[PDB]
Design a protein around this ligand. Structure first.
Ligand SMILES: [Ca+2]
Ligand SMILES: [Ca+2]
Ligand SMILES: [Ca+2]
Lengths: 231, 234, 234
């Protein structure tokens, strides 16, 4: 059923992209989301993958994200974006966690969500409110890199099944998967095998760091769907 | 049940209609003039192949070029599989009407009662006649994944009737699910006129080749064609 | 008094045959040439795992890639368990002859005296050799449940001999019973040439890996393998 795409060609430069809500500076639908602020998510022609327009996120400790509501009753979600980042993800000393993409239950907070990006310097996933992280600690501060300053196609597949799954592809290669309790470091989201329940109300993209890293991220050619996407 | 048939085209004599198949060529069932001296045709070729030295080559367009085989009676499902090499892409194409490489029909005599898999409106997808419904819906037209031109692709179409409340179609290309039907709202124009059991009566013939309703001429080669009432995979 | 062994493959060196296992690779018992440079092999791998960092990877096909462990003498019953990740499915598939992931054999030297669990004629099931009986019966071929490809599945096979009038096999995947033998008529040809005690002599070795008699090459990973004369858990 469900499909949405956005190449950002329809939006006006310097504005919040048409059709999207925001999570900017810790506020849902921050009235003050513009490029004159220090944190923002706006259409740019500064750079793009398709056409002349992409979205530009400037954020850090404070999140800069666009948000879209998802229809009720989804059994799976695929999120796909072309992504260009001022810093790399993965194989990174002294990272706590940082994320570019995810799904959340309630628009008003960042406290109940699945966050895809890196955890402990490996590509991976943080679930809140449990604050579990995957993969487990044997793998931290290593593994594959999403390089800075090049366009990457990122696909996250989330399937909700006896154990809910997540798979994250970059440039076609599978860099991260969750398929059992033991893929979480701290036991598996406090014992919940159906850990994506309640999570599929919103999809979000942009940048949020809990490692105090300020970043510019551009994204383009976003898709979400309840059927497989690929690059 | 247990139905399975395979053809690698290795046994057939070059430049002839593959042995064992009927045709639908130039709008005629078992056209008697199916060779390379016509404008549309379906013949064994040794110039390109996936398996061995031989494939079937289809040249057609607005006029269909197709090989056809009857099915057993009483099938609850059909799987069709082919290695496919196309002179033009399917999918993500401006201003397409619809074009198909593969499908099933009720009556060999015409092309007016069938399920056609290929693209509709420039998205990989499915056309049912005579309702003329198409899927997916308009919000996805002229976009989505491609079956690229000028490369070998494994194509699998799965059509499930049986005891399903809603009949299903799934099309895999090179392992990846590119197109699915599982509810009335997968159709653009309602839902094959309200028929949840939309594959009923359709499983009499299976056909392969090329037929465009966008007036696009094409060369398709196919090889390692398979048909079955149990799953096929690449 | 009982018997329990498990292997999570965490102790073993990557690219080596797992520590403490024998092999049956390329139709040779304890093939000295078992590494990732050969076309067929069974080795510890770190690119994929269920538990920890390590699992065992089999690459094989027509030629078997298996790890083998002796079982103690005197057993009345055997449970095998593996976490299994396959590059192709088992069950519900057109045109299969038979393929197996798991089993027990009477002697290490050969593949000719054994119980083979996997699929038979495209249903999940069991082949006994040398009788070549297969279960379930023909009624059920090319259908039924699947072990899907490209996911981790817990496979438990229970084989009960002992004082049963008719020896039994039960195969669970992810908790669901997918295959059962408890009478002569569960076999297509009436039960291993009239032998009600068809596991007799079979419990000398357990093996795990891949072997196809349908000419399908595959990559399998397995992990958390257990054997026991008592029930096993997922
Ligand atoms: Ca764009
Ligand atoms: Ca051929
Ligand atoms: Ca392990």
């Amino acid at each position: 059923g469900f499909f949405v795409s956005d190449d950002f060609e329809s939006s006006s430069v310097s504005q919040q992209p048409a059709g999207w809500d925001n999570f900017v500076g810790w506020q849902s639908n921050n009235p003050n989301n513009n490029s004159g602020q220090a944190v923002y998510a706006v259409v740019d022609n500064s750079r793009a993958y398709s056409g002349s327009q992409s979205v530009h996120f400037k954020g850090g400790a404070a999140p800069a994200q666009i948000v879209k509501a998802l229809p009720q009753g989804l059994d799976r979600v695929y999120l796909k974006a072309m992504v260009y980042m001022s810093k790399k993800l993965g194989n990174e000393a002294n990272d706590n966690h940082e994320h570019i993409m995810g799904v959340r239950a309630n628009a008003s907070g960042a406290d109940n969500e699945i966050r895809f990006g890196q955890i402990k310097g490996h590509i991976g996933t943080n679930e809140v409110p449990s604050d579990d992280i995957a993969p487990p600690q044997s793998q931290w501060y290593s593994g594959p890199e999403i390089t800075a300053n090049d366009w990457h196609c990122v696909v996250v597949e989330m399937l909700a099944l006896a154990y809910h799954q997540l798979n994250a592809y970059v440039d076609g290669e599978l860099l991260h998967s969750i398929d059992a309790a033991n893929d979480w470091n701290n036991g598996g989201v406090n014992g919940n095998a159906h850990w994506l329940d309640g999570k599929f109300n919103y999809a979000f993209f942009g940048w949020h760091s809990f490692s105090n890293n300020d970043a510019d991220v551009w994204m383009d050619d976003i898709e979400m769907s309840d059927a497989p996407l690929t690059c």
